[PDB]
RNA sequence: UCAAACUCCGUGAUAGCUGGUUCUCCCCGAAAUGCAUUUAGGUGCAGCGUCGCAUGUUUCUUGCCGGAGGUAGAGCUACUGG
């Protein structure tokens, strides 16, 4: 019989959150931003070239 | 404390700048170029990476073939000049 502990999300339904800045074995020490620039502390507008 | 005091608030001011950004392993893996920029230590796009999808050897290497060049070299009584 189907109880609450039998319920599971479907495969691929749930992907783990990527946690940046949590070590160099992951997206660590820059969070995929690279080193410097405007793009290292802010985001650049799309309306700007 | 003074080329405009101090305090609170606006306010977590803004900083193309500096610094920092914390556990793991597996696979792949750059760039530091071009163009433009009140631009030149920034940024957009392209190039280069990855992932996915589609296509599938088209890529690449070698041989052969067809081709255009004007460098090296050479030449100048073949031009311009010396």
Query: Residue A44 has what DSSP assignment?
Result: -
What's the resolution in A? 2.8
Residue A27: which nucleotide is closest by CA–C1'? B21
Residues A32, A20 contacting (CB under 8 angstroms): yes
Q: HSE (CB half, 13 Å, CA atoms) of A35? A: 0
For nucleic chain B, give residues with Cβ below 7 angstroms from it.
A 19-26, 28-31, 33, 36-42, 44, 48-49
What span, in angstroms and rounded, lies between the C-alpha atoms of A43 and A33? 10
Protein CA A6 to sugar C1' B50 (Å)? 37
What span, in angstroms and rounded, lies between the C-alpha atoms of A34 and A27? 10
| Residue from A31, A23, A24, A10 nearest A41 by CA | A31
Indicate which technique resolved this structure: cryo-EM
Tokens for A38, please give them: 């405007």
Residue A33: which nucleotide is closest by CA–C1'? B21
Buried (b) or exposed (e) across A24-44, using 16+ Cβ within 10 A?
eeeeeeeeeeeeeeeeeeeee
């Amino acid at each position: 019989v189907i109880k609450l502990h039998d319920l599971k999300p479907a495969p691929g339904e749930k992907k783990a959150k990527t946690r940046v800045g949590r070590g160099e074995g992951s997206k660590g020490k820059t969070a995929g931003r690279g080193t410097k620039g405007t793009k290292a502390r802010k985001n650049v507008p799309v309306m700007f070239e």
